[PDB]
Amino acid sequence: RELTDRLQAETDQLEEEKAELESEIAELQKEKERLEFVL
Amino acid sequence: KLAAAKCRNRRRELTDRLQAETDQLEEEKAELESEIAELQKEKERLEFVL
Numbered sequence: 001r002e003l004t005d006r007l008q009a010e011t012d013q014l015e016e017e018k019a020e021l022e023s024e025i026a027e028l029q030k031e032k033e034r035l036e037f038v039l
Numbered sequence: 040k041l042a043a044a045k046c047r048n049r050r051r052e053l054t055d056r057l058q059a060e061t062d063q064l065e066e067e068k069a070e071l072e073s074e075i076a077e078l079q080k081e082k083e084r085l086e087f088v089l
Contacts, residue, residue, distance in 0.1 A: 014078070
């Protein structure tokens, strides 16, 4: 289980970055929607 | 009429740029999802053999 943990630790890193991207996407869409629908 | 069309195009320009940025982030997210898959694909090869 030693070689598998380095893999999982790198998976964890990528998952944080992915969550950061999803957070940016949602915020930009909220802004887009603000402009589109005039809110 | 033409002046109203200018403000419209400027916002439509802005909303398009917000969408072009979104598409870029979505591409980046897709690349991250590949790398994750390739890593889990190996965590299973090893865990399988081990």
